[PDB]
Amino acid sequence: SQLEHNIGLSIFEPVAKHRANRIVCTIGPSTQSVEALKNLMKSGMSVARMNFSHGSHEYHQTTINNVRAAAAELGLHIGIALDTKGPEIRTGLFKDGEVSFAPGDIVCVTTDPAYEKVGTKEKFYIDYPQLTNAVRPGGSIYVDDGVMTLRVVSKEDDRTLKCHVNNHHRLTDRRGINLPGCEVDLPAVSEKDRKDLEFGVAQGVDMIFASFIRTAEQVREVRAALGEKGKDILIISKIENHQGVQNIDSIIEASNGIMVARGDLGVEIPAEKVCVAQMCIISKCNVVGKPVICATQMLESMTSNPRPTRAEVSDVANAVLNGADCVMLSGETAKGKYPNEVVQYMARICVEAQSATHDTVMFNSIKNLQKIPMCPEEAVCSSAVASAFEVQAKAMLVLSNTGRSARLISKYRPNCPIICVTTRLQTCRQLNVTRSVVSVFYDAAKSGEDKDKEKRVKLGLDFAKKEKYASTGDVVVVVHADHSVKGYPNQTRLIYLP
Amino acid sequence: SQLEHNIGLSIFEPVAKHRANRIVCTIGPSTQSVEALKNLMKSGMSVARMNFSHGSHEYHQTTINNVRAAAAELGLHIGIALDTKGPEIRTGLFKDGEVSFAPGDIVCVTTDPAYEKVGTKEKFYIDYPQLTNAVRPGGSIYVDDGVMTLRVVSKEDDRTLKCHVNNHHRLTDRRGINLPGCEVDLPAVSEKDRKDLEFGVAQGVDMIFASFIRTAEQVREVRAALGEKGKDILIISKIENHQGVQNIDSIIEASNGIMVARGDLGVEIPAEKVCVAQMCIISKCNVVGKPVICATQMLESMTSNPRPTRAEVSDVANAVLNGADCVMLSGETAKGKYPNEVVQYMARICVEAQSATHDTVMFNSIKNLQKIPMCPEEAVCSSAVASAFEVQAKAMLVLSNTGRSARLISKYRPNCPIICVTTRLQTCRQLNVTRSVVSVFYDAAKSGEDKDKEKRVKLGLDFAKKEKYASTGDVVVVVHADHSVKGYPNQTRLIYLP
Amino acid sequence: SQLEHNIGLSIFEPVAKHRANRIVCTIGPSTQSVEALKNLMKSGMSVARMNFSHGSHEYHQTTINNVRAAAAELGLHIGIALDTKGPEIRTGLFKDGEVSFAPGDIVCVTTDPAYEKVGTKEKFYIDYPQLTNAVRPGGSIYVDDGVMTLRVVSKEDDRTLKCHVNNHHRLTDRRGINLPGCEVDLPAVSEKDRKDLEFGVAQGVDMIFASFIRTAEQVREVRAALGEKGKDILIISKIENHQGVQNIDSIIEASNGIMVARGDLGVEIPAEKVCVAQMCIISKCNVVGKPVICATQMLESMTSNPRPTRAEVSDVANAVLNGADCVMLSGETAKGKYPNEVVQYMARICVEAQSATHDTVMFNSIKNLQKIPMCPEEAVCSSAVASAFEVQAKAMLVLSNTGRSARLISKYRPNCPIICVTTRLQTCRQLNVTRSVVSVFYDAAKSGEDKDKEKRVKLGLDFAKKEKYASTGDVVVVVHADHSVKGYPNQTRLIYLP
Amino acid sequence: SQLEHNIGLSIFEPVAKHRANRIVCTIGPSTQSVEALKNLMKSGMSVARMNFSHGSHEYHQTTINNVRAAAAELGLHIGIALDTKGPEIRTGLFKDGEVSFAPGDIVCVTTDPAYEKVGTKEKFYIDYPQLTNAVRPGGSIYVDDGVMTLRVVSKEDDRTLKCHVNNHHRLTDRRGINLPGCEVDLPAVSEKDRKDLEFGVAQGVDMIFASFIRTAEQVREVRAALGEKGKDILIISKIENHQGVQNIDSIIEASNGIMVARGDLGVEIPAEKVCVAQMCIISKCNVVGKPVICATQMLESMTSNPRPTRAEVSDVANAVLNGADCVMLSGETAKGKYPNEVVQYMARICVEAQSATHDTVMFNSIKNLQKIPMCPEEAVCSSAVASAFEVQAKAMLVLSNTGRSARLISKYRPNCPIICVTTRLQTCRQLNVTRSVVSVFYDAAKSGEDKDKEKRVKLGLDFAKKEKYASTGDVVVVVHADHSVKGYPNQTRLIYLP
Ligand SMILES: O=P(O)(O)OC[C@H]1O[C@@](CO)(OP(=O)(O)O)[C@@H](O)[C@@H]1O
Ligand SMILES: O=P(O)(O)OC[C@H]1O[C@@](CO)(OP(=O)(O)O)[C@@H](O)[C@@H]1O
Ligand SMILES: [K+]
Ligand SMILES: [K+]
Ligand SMILES: [K+]
Ligand SMILES: [K+]
Ligand SMILES: [Mg+2]
Ligand SMILES: [Mg+2]
Ligand SMILES: [Mg+2]
Ligand SMILES: [Mg+2]
């Protein structure tokens, strides 16, 4: 039982030497330089997130170029993620850059763009033109991470609502607006999003973090916007409203993976329900073996402080225990004072949680929920993980070209690294969102077809030695096809390192 | 499996009506007035914590008086806890009252009291005489609640260590010292702590939260200081350093309950290991059936902000899922801007976590770790809880004078309220740290001795109906003694409410 | 696991002192005398079976009278069971008392009663008048425990079939006939059966063993034949054909209990399938808590030998491990040379199997299959058994008037005796088919109403002492109602023997 | 749970097509002819047992020759087992060649060889010199295969016990003696046994069933007698008394396999304890993965009767459910009237029991008791079986030259056939005692060394198709070494049949 496992835990034992979970960092002013990015990589960053809520294409081009230069210097494969603006709603600007409200202040909010730059305490702009269709008298408008609420007193006209301010707040330029419980009808892919996604494809990004995904059909709209040239780019659907949570099964089935986007989610639904959504979404992703990312305010106070709070450490550890492949940083790295330190903390917390995880509970719970008969490659991958447990293997090695076989091994949650030898650089980069996987690139154009697998297996066993995963005489579990079969792995071998 | 449980969770279903977990609030300038306390109680405070690290006896007397007046006004039984200052190691003073250090600075730290009042960049005093035995070259000394760290380079003589400063910091007079991982030998009760415990006994406090408990012998020393007149006051031992963690079994044995005191703990041991200590300590307390409180920075940002961060919500939910009876607020209620709202959030999060808990998993895991044969009262209590699950009882009812039988039922983690009819007001107050229990006072001097239990059972069943735990025709599981057994309950009955 | 349990088994440990399983003995020439019956009772007989396939009412009256006299002498409550003839088919008599057949012998079998007494190798009688409707050319007639088969060559006329003998056999008077795979349409209650059952009621038998039960509706026909005066007599349905096995669920629901009647069953279905039927039927009875009896050839060779074969010992042990309440003897006691010894062997084997049974596997497997919410009396009885395990109780004590509460405790398979204090002698007798139960009669007409349960509880605790189940200072789990509730037990107490 | 499994069984569903368990038949006058042996083989005999307790070398040579001629005619590989006479204690002779005893008779038993030829009612000889050390006053001596029992009253001098006769019996010359529960010290190999083992080695028998193995040292003595030329012959140790049971772990360790020799065992230990020994020994053999045979009186009544009793059917089914690889026939085939029919019944019962077995329960229970880390070949074999369950493979295929890898796969109890391609005919014959395995011989002298395994794999897959284990498009799990590893299999593959 979990209780019996817990009472045997020790703070005095050595922790795992090899970190299984992965860290996604948002790039901004703190971290955009090649130097900064190198230090982030050294600190533990596996994926660079570009937040296309802000910044021009030129700004994000700099991010892309600098990430690639930093990664090339260090010899790493680092994923690059494009996080869409999506159907965001924001206020306009304010006369002065700031305005302050007390409870009972009556304020008009207008969709009329004449007011965009000249917001005051009496009247200001919101950039959602169908506002007065979406929110009725008696309804509420959440402003600025849901910190301030307005009650809609009346509809003055088609462009204007008269509102009652519920609480003290200092409102600044371009804050987020949420309208939970309203019929908000904005596209998953705006014209702006479409241009962003075409930019991502042109520049060869590895994955999209698609904002406010509500339905499977919206996932398909993102995939269509990516086009023929973008068909291998991962779509990670961000779940950040009620309808996304409701439609989670069909969204998971359509997507390559999921982000629990807790910022918007915890304004769209009652903040205390986010914990239940998180547990449920992560476990549903684990069961089907798709990567899942926990996001938002995980180490928030380290934006200004050199150490995290006790709740923040707990939050990161528990996301890992819940079963998340990745954990994410936003403002902590984009604009924080301690971007290297926050990533180093997050990496130490991941490792402690990984080391406090029962070896085989996930393996058995996940396997017990699969339909029998399995496909042969899934019978091979699940039984390979079982054999790694039985022999206490220090590493597994899998040949994967698309990533599929590495993700299938990772699904069964081994307690050792999964070295993936792959023939595609993009697979190297995309496998950064999958727990345990460490990628090695085999250039088949340069080195030959390797039909009998020997070159790639040697490359991975040499990597295992070099990286100090294992040494001579250790057993490694090696998964790939035999000499005939094409398209999937049908074979598992146990090999002693030479 | 936990995985299978998680994938079946819904954010859409109604949550439990009756909150099982309990909230400890620290009282301070935000909360000391009778009116503030009434609001805190309405918001969900069960125990008022006085932090005797600060404030005079006169200040805390006001808290005591105000808590009792507020509780009497609302007809509630509210626990009052005295949290001791405890032992401390501090620096001496510094010339000009401040000194600034930079990384790489080499500083001698001395236990020679000649240097107590004249610390410089070169050399300063620490008031712990065993320092050069406690910490070895290569070890660390932390200064100012962990903010500056020194590495010990060498021992110069039996009173002097040469140290390497790790980071920029400015020290002022008499800053706190922690010796992480080191065996420190300081009395359990200071002369200050004695006067404070004498005050607590005289004023009739319900429990002591005893700081920095390192051994079972220290618990016994606190117990001896409380003396004959304080023999019924609970001792809740605060685990704050590696010794407390290492000696946890014997400490739990000597104590009435445990606090996981994460503030000091996460300075004494690596911050990332606090999660592991927490899980281990909570589960150990569950297994023996003693109350355990999770403390410190749970909803910290609500000191200033009207909503918590996403990490904070998850910290509270996970402390409840871990198995904690109580969660605690410190500066959030003592000095924060939103003391009622923070308690209300904490209550709503507890309820969500409770509603997400698998009914019978804790019950079974706890029961499976008990030594067989049980004592008769524990067999009775554990089988009473089993019967509550089998019939879907809406409440249980137990007669307990000392609290012991109520805690024994709570140990088995029913999913319904445990109504405890007691003949002692202090037992009502003390049972506030125990999950699920709601107390009703039976005045035996007023109503008679009730040898056949019937008056007390009637009071309990009337209370269940009035407080809307159950109505006519519902089953309640009722635990007490038969007509001849004394000293413990040997009987369980299923009764339909008339 | 069972495997892990098995490898820990020892032949060198003491066995259980108190036998839980019960033995049903068939009475005949070996055992009908008062003396013989006393020795059978001393040896371990709990139920005397009268086989109404043979013998007149006067013969069976002698059995009834002699059982009662023997039981009165020894102060025992012994059940008396009436096992119906039912829809049996038999041959007639043969010229000489015997005839011998070789394979290929052509023989006519006739329904014409003119041939009843004068059977020869050429032609003989079968007492089923619709024979030539039931079995077609190409069909098979099984004769004499299915030892000899005839292929039906042709229908000579409405009274006569011409048959081909398949194997060597010596046929004697009045052997059984089976027609598996035929539509045989005989009543569950013939006119003969009706008179037998009215005799059973008039003479106060405890239970009917109803032969060849095919459907629930047939169980209801037996209950109707028993009439107003027979409404409390147990009906134990014997499962001995294909259709009985098919309809097992509805038959179990209609009956008080089941016998796996393996003699006919293993001719009606392929003999090797009987093992599967047995396991399935016994487990289905366990799940609903109705008594189940394993019958036929369990110790067959002891009919003539003073020791059983290795297969026979195994058979008895495995019936007990399968979960059977009772095991039965037929010819072994009815007509055997060693009736006392065979019962003594059967009792020793029962005890060894009981002692090799994992304490709690049955309890947990049975409980896990029950629907929640339970009725209160079933929550009480199941949790009482759990408390007996937790305290290692040496006995349980239940007040039961109908038997229902004793059977409900026995359903959960405690490892200690269940002392049942009952107000009806017939309940004492009927509880002999329920595992673990030992009955004590409380005569309420003589001793008083005992509303507060104290007289009956004292009677049972005194019995526990006298019979050496427990002694002073041992804990007993005592189940009955509190002072108000009527109709079922709502209370469990743990009591130390005074 | 087993309970839940049982309630879902149906007698109506089709049974397994391929029988997993194996049948050992004793050869005698009923079965010795080539034609009788061919029929036995067609009926399901896998191993022919020669009982060297009777018959000359010339007699057993005929069996050997006839078994080989019959097997060659049918193209089968049939194991030949030599079952030793073993050690024995006997009485001396009696005057007039017989003496009759009655209960209460007092008889002196002596180890003084003066009395060897002149035993009387007063005094007779037993040929075991340590008798007065082995058995103590109050102990028992059994005479004539347990039929008469004496209680030892007192020791008269160092060679004489005074005994009390318990039952009527007539002794003739040199009857067997058993000393139940007593430590007996007799050589493992008699001078007779030596000549018999020499004959077995010279004639090329596949296994020895070694009688009355009491210790591991005795197994080693048998192994040493077989010598260099018999080093590949299996030793199956027969457990026949309490010493064998007590020392079972070390005996299993020294042996190739175990027989539960229930005839002698149930004379040496109480008959009712044989069930407990059987379960324990079978499970212990399963856990280490060595073959275990259940023996003696399994279908005894079929010596004379054309159908078995109900107890006999259940004994066979339960030996299979217990986990036995093999079941054995003795007098049923050696001297019975229905040798083919008894083997055919035994096969049909095995198949029913197999079909009633929960697929994966044995697999999981066995795997969970193995010490971790496993050796690589055992991880490979156990994960191969796991993959067979996950894909519902219809067969497995293993290359094994010694038999070791085939036994290792069988240890994990797949539900399908295990095709073993071997390069040794003796390995084909020896694998007949191992559940599920069907052997095919690869002639490496004829077809080549097959370093890359391809010829052997082809032979195995062609065999699967031809014997209708699997057809085109079915998955088969294939276990052997990769192209460089020698000494053991390190590789498993899932292959679709072409
Ligand atoms: O790229 P994915 O879908 O993971 O499939 C990879 C698998 O396919 C195979 C066989 O086709 O690749 P490869 O041809 O590159 O050797 C296996 O060896 C390998 O394990
Ligand atoms: O006869 P059954 O149906 O078992 O019911 C017996 C139960 O009913 C009660 C209460 O009605 O009997 P009683 O009145 O004889 O005391 C319980 O005490 C007893 O356990
Ligand atoms: K965004
Ligand atoms: K304090
Ligand atoms: K009958
Ligand atoms: K022999
Ligand atoms: Mg968002
Ligand atoms: Mg502290
Ligand atoms: Mg019958
Ligand atoms: Mg023998």
XYZ file of C-alpha atoms and ligand atoms in Angstrom, chain A residues 49 51 53 83-85 88 90 178 211-212 238-240 259 261-265 296, ligand 7:
22
model
C 8.592 27.667 -24.498
C 4.739 32.531 -25.309
C 0.630 35.896 -26.193
C 2.432 28.440 -27.097
C -0.463 30.129 -28.955
C -2.222 33.290 -27.873
C -7.473 35.497 -25.040
C -7.778 41.501 -22.391
C -12.148 35.626 -17.954
C -4.334 27.428 -25.740
C -7.977 27.037 -24.545
C -3.877 23.093 -23.042
C -6.803 22.405 -20.747
C -7.897 25.656 -19.195
C -0.907 20.578 -20.576
C -2.839 24.948 -17.772
C -3.672 25.830 -14.152
C -3.538 29.661 -14.524
C -6.647 30.051 -16.669
C -8.156 26.819 -15.325
C 1.725 27.600 -13.777
Mg -3.623 30.037 -20.111
